[PDB]
Amino acid sequence: PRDVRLLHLLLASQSIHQYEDQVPLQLMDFAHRYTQGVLKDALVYNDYALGVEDIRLAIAARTQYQFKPTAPKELMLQLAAERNKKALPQVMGTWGVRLPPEKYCLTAKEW
Amino acid sequence: SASDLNRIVLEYLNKKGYHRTEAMLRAESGRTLTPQNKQSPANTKTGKFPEQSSIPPNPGKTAKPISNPTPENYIRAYSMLKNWVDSSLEIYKPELSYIMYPIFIYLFLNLVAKNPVYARRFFDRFSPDFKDFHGSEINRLFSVNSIDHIKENEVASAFQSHKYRITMSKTTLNLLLYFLNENESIGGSLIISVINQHLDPNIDLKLEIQKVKESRDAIKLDNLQLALPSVCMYTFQNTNKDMSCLDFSDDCRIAAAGFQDSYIKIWSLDGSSLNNPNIALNNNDKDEDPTCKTLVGHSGTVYSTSFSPDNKYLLSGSEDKTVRLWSMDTHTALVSYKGHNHPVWDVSFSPLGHYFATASHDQTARLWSCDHIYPLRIFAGHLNDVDCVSFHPNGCYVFTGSSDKTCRMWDVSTGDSVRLFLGHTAPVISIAVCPDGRWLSTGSEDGIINVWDIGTGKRLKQMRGHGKNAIYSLSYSKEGNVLISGGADHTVRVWDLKKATTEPSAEPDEGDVTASINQDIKEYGRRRTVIPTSDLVASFYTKKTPVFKVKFSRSNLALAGGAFRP
Amino acid sequence: TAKVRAEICLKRTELQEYDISNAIPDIVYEGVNTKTLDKMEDASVDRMLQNGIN
Amino acid sequence: YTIWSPQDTVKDVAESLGLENINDDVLKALAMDVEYRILEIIEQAVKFKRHSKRDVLTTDDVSKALRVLNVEPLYGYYDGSEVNKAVSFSKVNTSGGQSVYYLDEEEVDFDRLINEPLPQVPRLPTFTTHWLAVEGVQPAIIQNPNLNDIRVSQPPFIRGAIVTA
């Protein structure tokens, strides 16, 4: 197929020279489902009001819950600053590994 | 575009409130290298142990790396000498059996005057060994617990006046002096002060210790030369590409390998029993023990695994969003540690075993503690996810490398990043900091190692001998700087860290045939071949098994480890 | 060995067991790689030897 | 454009919905975003490949870049006798003005799937140790390589620079 060897060139363009056989098949069956869902939601959003801003609405509807979020460094910095307010607790000074209390450990449990 | 960055830096300092002289001096401080600390791994003469004071670490009360230069209680300072004379049934055994008594008596009588409860520890710790040799005198020394209790016991009060005589040979006196000079700050000087002020050796003593120190100074090794290590390779056979990164313990008795089907496999590397009977011997020889124990607590694939320096606990990080703790002497799980929402990729204990740091897919590293279920610090500030994690050898900074071609040094208390090291071109995959502590080394997935110094933050040099491939592990020489890199191109390579720097590290005075002709063959092409740095010296190939782990032991013997691939 | 040891002792003042450089140490335990194959084969023959029970 | 499809792949899903004619700006921007999402799957796949200590990109390395990126799972890419690259790209062309490949598959009975014997299972893992080096040279036991057939086997970008002490 044209897109199996186009995926071969895409994988080789990012320096991936060893892979299995069903990996471009999995990429094509991902891209089919993603484009079909995006175009169905865009047909809904065009019956509501095709065009490119319609596609933008349909791919901003589902960016919000599945793929990798964008610029998450400042929210993570805020969250880190909320966690790094508390100073560190007192540690043992007997040069070993101390466990939690016995109810917070996976031992006093039953089947 | 770097002069414009220099101008942006100067205007930033001018608007953020640095005087012109102050900004010039901070620039000149930023440019010069971190100088040499002569007590670099804290040699046991002028070096001290860390305090066990039950507080967490704090990198404050501390001057800059740019500027030039750089109580010890009686029970450990006596137990040093006790174990040193106890490790010998040699020709010099009963002379130490003679001289072990009055040093204990004088340490006890000098410690009752300062701390009574430490003295009550010290008396009953070393009591029942020479009771049959010295009679009821230790029973007479039961009732001494204060300064006024010394006036009750007439022989204890006489021990200040009557200096205890001992007739000692010259070889035994020189053996004791050259043992208690080679480690002063453990307590050797504290033993020497009691010997000088309270004993009567038959054969001045201060001139003798001066001659001991001067003759010990007359012959040392100033600038060390390189040494090529011996590598012992552990090859695992019947793992059908489903064995992730493994680790060896310290004493090299246990190996831990994380599988893709949610087991931890535990191998006794000595062929031992690994059943921990402990004399109970109840039942169950009906089971099959192939000197190997399996640990089933995870529900995802184990991507990392780390051993405690105590070597009694194992810490396994998986792709189910927990890190679990295992006891290596009953082979069960103890604690689950839930603070991540993405897979865990690199767990690593502290130097002192206090608290472990973790790497995960959520672009943040997390600091933990083995007694707390939930994290203590969040290390956020990377652009991509964190791949490797490692502490400074004092347990006071954290080093994280990430897939956005950079790594960072984090303050362990305030949480915020102190250093950002730029210059790589690939995901940083393994990081390691030298036992000196002034130099950081890491390897990427481009097959290029490089070293920075933590004071300047810029690059000293790089290392260009591995194939254009991953550098899976990294290890350091115990005393000195020789880097051992076990990567993905089936080789284990050896690197001199001190070639192109201001420290040349004692090159030989006077040629080869194989040198500079091996990569002058270049049959595959100049642009399609690697050209090694002048720092690479040797490279041991493994014949079709890759090396997941390099672990340099204490005695110039490294261990490599990996799985036989086809 | 009377010829080679004279040359060695004349060389040092400047089979065999005192060539110092070419010696490999010994491991406390190495794993099985060939004995377990024949062990599995004569164990399968032993499972044939038990009068035809699978 | 970019390298996924001008119209030749995305438009044949646009027609699968029922949508007859749409402009090429729509297909350009849509296919650009679709192969950006493909690269976004591929990068987490090579991250899982690197941290699984491997060199190929198996089908369970992209199937774990799905759970991370919350994508609904692509079932049916793992079968019996899971070998490395179990060859199954037999896609059959069908003619026309353009090309159409439809992935023929042979039907099978159930009673030749229940009356089918079980495969071979290997041994459980063991280890075996030797000396890779004793003083910085290699002792040339059977377990060591030959260092001259390392030239004729691997190119110097997957084996690195050979130097010896």
Side-chain angles (χ1 to χ4, degrees):
Chain A
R2 176 182 164 259
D3 285 303
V4 167
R5 64 185 69 92
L6 270 172
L7 274 174
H8 195 121
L9 267 299
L10 177 59
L11 282 150
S13 65
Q14 315 277 302
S15 315
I16 303 163
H17 303 304
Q18 278 103 29
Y19 41 86
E20 291 184 354
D21 50 323
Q22 289 169 148
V23 173
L25 187 54
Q26 255 171 335
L27 288 200
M28 284 179 320
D29 296 358
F30 150 76
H32 154 266
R33 218 174 44 183
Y34 174 65
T35 323
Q36 177 157 354
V38 155
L39 281 164
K40 187 177 299 196
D41 301 336
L43 272 179
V44 166
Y45 289 156
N46 198 28
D47 280 15
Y48 184 62
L50 53 90
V52 60
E53 323 293 326
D54 168 40
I55 294 293
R56 290 190 36 169
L57 267 296
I59 70 179
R62 43 175 76 242
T63 300
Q64 301 184 327
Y65 72 96
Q66 54 185 359
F67 285 95
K68 191 61 72 190
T70 320
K73 195 188 151 149
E74 64 98 11
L75 176 70
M76 281 313 152
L77 272 181
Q78 291 272 12
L79 203 156
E82 311 309 308
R83 180 62 83 95
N84 305 6
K85 287 321 196 314
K86 320 282 178 182
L88 293 159
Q90 308 299 321
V91 68
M92 206 183 52
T94 316
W95 274 339
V97 161
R98 186 161 56 167
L99 292 196
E102 194 46 80
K103 51 165 164 172
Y104 298 96
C105 302
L106 315 168
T107 304
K109 292 179 194 297
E110 182 261 359
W111 283 98
Chain B
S1 296
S3 87
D4 315 281
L5 195 79
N6 183 47
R7 195 268 307 277
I8 290 170
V9 163
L10 184 133
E11 297 286 336
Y12 178 84
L13 297 194
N14 182 267
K15 71 188 288 184
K16 217 52 74 184
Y18 300 91
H19 193 267
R20 173 63 138 87
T21 302
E22 171 75 20
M24 281 263 278
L25 290 182
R26 275 164 171 274
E28 294 187 21
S29 194
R31 288 307 105 172
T32 75
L33 284 183
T34 316
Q36 174 86 91
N37 171 36
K38 321 291 169 299
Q39 308 94 314
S40 100
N43 47 357
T44 179
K45 284 184 283 292
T46 52
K48 287 107 179 179
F49 280 114
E51 306 275 296
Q52 35 189 356
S53 85
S54 82
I55 72 178
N58 215 324
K61 47 147 191 170
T62 296
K64 66 191 71 62
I66 302 306
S67 283
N68 292 255
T70 181
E72 204 64 87
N73 54 317
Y74 294 84
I75 302 106
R76 55 167 48 154
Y78 172 75
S79 315
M80 166 186 80
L81 195 67
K82 180 71 205 74
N83 291 126
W84 178 66
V85 306
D86 193 75
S87 46
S88 285
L89 217 172
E90 314 277 311
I91 61 166
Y92 52 87
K93 181 253 297 183
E95 189 148 32
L96 309 166
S97 178
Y98 286 143
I99 68 158
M100 201 31 73
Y101 170 80
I103 175 72
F104 159 72
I105 289 300
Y106 282 156
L107 280 185
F108 176 67
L109 258 54
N110 219 329
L111 163 67
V112 294
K114 309 177 188 60
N115 281 57
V117 55
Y118 284 139
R120 185 62 180 170
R121 288 171 153 95
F122 178 63
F123 194 87
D124 301 67
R125 180 63 188 89
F126 311 100
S127 158
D129 51 353
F130 37 73
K131 38 180 183 60
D132 54 355
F133 282 163
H134 292 75
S136 199
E137 193 169 4
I138 67 152
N139 301 114
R140 187 68 195 273
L141 296 151
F142 277 166
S143 58
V144 283
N145 264 297
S146 87
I147 309 193
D148 293 328
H149 274 284
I150 305 309
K151 270 82 73 179
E152 202 268 344
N153 192 22
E154 73 290 338
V155 59
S157 287
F159 278 155
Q160 213 292 316
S161 66
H162 162 64
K163 304 172 65 173
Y164 209 100
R165 59 106 178 174
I166 174 68
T167 296
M168 218 195 308
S169 86
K170 182 51 75 191
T171 184
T172 299
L173 190 146
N174 266 333
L175 202 61
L176 262 298
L177 266 297
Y178 279 107
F179 168 69
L180 297 156
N181 180 60
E182 87 186 29
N183 40 8
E184 310 194 68
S185 313
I186 298 193
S189 166
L190 184 143
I191 295 292
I192 274 175
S193 278
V194 162
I195 286 295
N196 170 50
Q197 288 316 110
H198 290 170
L199 272 303
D200 172 64
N202 313 64
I203 189 63
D204 199 306
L205 266 301
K206 294 260 199 55
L207 166 58
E208 190 266 344
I209 310 172
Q210 172 53 69
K211 277 183 179 182
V212 159
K213 293 175 69 172
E214 175 49 50
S215 71
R216 190 52 192 88
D217 197 310
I219 40 176
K220 292 191 203 311
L221 264 174
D222 290 330
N223 296 341
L224 297 184
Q225 215 181 312
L226 285 85
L228 263 295
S230 318
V231 183
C232 184
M233 168 69 181
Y234 289 84
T235 286
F236 288 84
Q237 301 287 144
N238 294 145
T239 72
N240 319 114
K241 278 202 178 49
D242 59 349
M243 212 198 71
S244 316
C245 197
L246 79 153
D247 212 319
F248 315 107
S249 59
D250 296 271
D251 74 355
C252 307
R253 213 182 185 187
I254 304 167
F259 276 65
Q260 293 291 106
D261 291 344
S262 306
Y263 328 117
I264 288 277
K265 273 281 186 174
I266 291 309
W267 323 89
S268 42
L269 289 193
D270 304 355
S272 315
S273 159
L274 209 66
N275 203 2
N276 308 57
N278 276 237
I279 234 162
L281 270 306
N282 38 56
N283 207 357
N284 309 318
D285 46 16
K286 57 98 175 178
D287 311 298
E288 307 313 299
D289 166 55
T291 78
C292 173
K293 291 312 169 211
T294 175
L295 309 179
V296 280
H298 279 158
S299 81
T301 70
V302 194
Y303 281 131
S304 176
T305 296
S306 194
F307 263 109
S308 49
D310 194 275
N311 293 318
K312 280 282 191 152
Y313 305 105
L314 192 58
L315 203 46
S316 59
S318 174
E319 90 182 0
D320 71 91
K321 281 81 68 179
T322 69
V323 180
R324 283 176 85 109
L325 188 70
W326 312 88
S327 160
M328 293 321 287
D329 36 1
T330 177
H331 302 279
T332 41
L334 309 176
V335 197
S336 279
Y337 291 99
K338 307 181 293 311
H340 282 301
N341 53 4
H342 268 175
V344 169
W345 276 345
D346 198 43
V347 73
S348 82
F349 275 101
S350 202
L352 308 186
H354 279 159
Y355 52 81
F356 64 99
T358 312
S360 193
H361 189 79
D362 45 16
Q363 312 174 338
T364 61
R366 292 202 207 282
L367 193 88
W368 296 71
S369 275
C370 272
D371 52 356
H372 291 326
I373 315 293
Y374 311 121
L376 269 65
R377 284 283 167 283
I378 303 180
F379 299 114
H382 272 147
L383 269 76
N384 216 317
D385 45 18
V386 180
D387 295 284
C388 57
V389 71
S390 72
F391 288 83
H392 205 93
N394 55 6
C396 184
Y397 295 89
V398 189
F399 287 91
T400 58
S402 69
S403 309
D404 52 301
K405 310 172 287 291
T406 197
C407 66
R408 275 175 186 259
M409 180 178 65
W410 310 81
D411 207 286
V412 78
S413 68
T414 77
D416 59 337
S417 284
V418 189
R419 272 313 164 274
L420 167 81
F421 298 109
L422 297 172
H424 264 284
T425 39
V428 165
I429 179 60
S430 172
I431 198 150
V433 50
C434 67
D436 182 11
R438 318 179 301 124
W439 285 358
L440 177 74
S441 66
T442 189
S444 58
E445 220 179 358
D446 210 359
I448 301 188
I449 321 179
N450 48 3
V451 292
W452 308 264
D453 66 320
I454 317 188
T456 301
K458 273 169 49 178
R459 179 182 289 171
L460 304 149
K461 55 171 195 181
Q462 40 183 330
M463 318 283 208
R464 255 190 319 264
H466 265 267
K468 297 299 164 186
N469 200 355
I471 309 165
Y472 280 161
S473 183
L474 212 56
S475 193
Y476 261 104
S477 198
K478 183 244 188 169
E479 275 291 348
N481 278 15
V482 163
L483 193 63
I484 306 304
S485 84
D489 34 12
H490 306 258
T491 176
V492 183
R493 291 189 205 263
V494 181
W495 310 88
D496 174 70
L497 282 83
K498 296 152 304 189
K499 204 86 169 312
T501 65
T502 43
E503 298 174 353
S505 84
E507 76 289 347
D509 42 0
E510 281 155 329
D512 213 317
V513 50
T514 300
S516 184
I517 70 164
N518 208 312
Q519 311 293 308
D520 203 4
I521 293 171
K522 46 160 282 307
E523 176 258 326
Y524 294 85
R526 164 176 188 246
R527 80 276 190 191
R528 218 167 56 100
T529 198
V530 291
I531 286 172
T533 42
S534 43
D535 308 335
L536 174 60
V537 290
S539 47
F540 323 121
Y541 293 93
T542 50
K543 72 102 175 179
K544 85 200 295 187
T545 176
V547 277
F548 298 158
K549 185 56 178 145
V550 290
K551 177 57 189 321
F552 196 83
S553 159
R554 315 279 84 83
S555 77
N556 207 63
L557 163 75
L559 313 194
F564 179 50
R565 193 67 105 178
Chain C
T1 73
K3 180 50 203 83
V4 55
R5 68 203 302 194
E7 190 42 77
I8 283 178
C9 305
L10 287 174
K11 266 297 295 174
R12 69 172 58 173
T13 72
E14 315 300 316
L15 310 183
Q16 58 266 2
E17 54 90 20
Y18 56 98
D19 282 298
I20 45 162
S21 300
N22 296 323
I24 61 159
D26 190 12
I27 199 79
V28 57
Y29 185 69
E30 80 269 43
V32 195
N33 66 328
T34 297
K35 184 76 172 296
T36 185
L37 276 79
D38 292 18
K39 174 184 319 203
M40 283 179 307
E41 291 157 279
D42 53 19
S44 178
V45 170
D46 219 333
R47 296 288 88 81
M48 295 322 100
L49 179 141
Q50 46 176 20
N51 309 68
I53 173 175
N54 190 280
Chain D
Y1 302 100
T2 59
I3 74 161
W4 171 240
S5 159
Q7 66 266 11
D8 195 77
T9 306
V10 167
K11 206 171 181 299
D12 294 275
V13 165
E15 308 320 281
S16 71
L17 287 188
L19 179 51
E20 198 46 70
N21 261 20
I22 47 176
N23 317 313
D24 67 345
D25 313 330
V26 161
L27 298 179
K28 270 156 60 182
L30 174 57
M32 164 192 267
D33 194 85
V34 164
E35 61 99 5
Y36 179 80
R37 256 68 195 186
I38 274 176
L39 286 183
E40 201 164 351
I41 287 189
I42 282 300
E43 289 152 332
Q44 276 68 242
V46 305
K47 284 163 177 170
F48 270 77
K49 163 204 91 166
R50 177 192 59 232
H51 291 280
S52 194
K53 292 285 194 276
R54 268 175 314 195
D55 44 356
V56 304
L57 192 86
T58 173
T59 60
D60 308 344
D61 275 346
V62 296
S63 177
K64 285 174 184 157
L66 290 196
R67 272 167 84 90
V68 164
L69 294 172
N70 304 303
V71 175
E72 304 140 21
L74 301 164
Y75 287 104
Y77 295 86
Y78 164 57
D79 45 350
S81 279
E82 186 211 348
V83 299
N84 206 287
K85 312 175 57 55
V87 188
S88 43
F89 51 88
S90 81
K91 269 167 294 300
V92 193
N93 200 338
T94 315
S95 44
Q98 317 305 314
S99 85
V100 156
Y101 299 83
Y102 72 96
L103 194 131
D104 195 316
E105 200 174 31
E106 293 178 353
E107 59 178 359
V108 76
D109 206 293
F110 275 167
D111 304 293
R112 275 181 277 104
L113 290 186
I114 317 180
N115 300 341
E116 176 173 354
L118 315 159
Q120 296 285 153
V121 46
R123 324 160 190 152
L124 84 161
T126 61
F127 77 111
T128 295
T129 175
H130 65 88
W131 265 265
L132 192 65
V134 183
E135 206 64 33
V137 301
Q138 302 184 75
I141 322 103
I142 180 173
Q143 287 115 332
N144 265 262
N146 272 26
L147 197 67
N148 68 305
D149 77 316
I150 302 190
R151 319 300 197 99
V152 307
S153 279
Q154 320 301 326
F157 277 167
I158 72 167
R159 68 154 179 84
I162 294 185
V163 284
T164 317

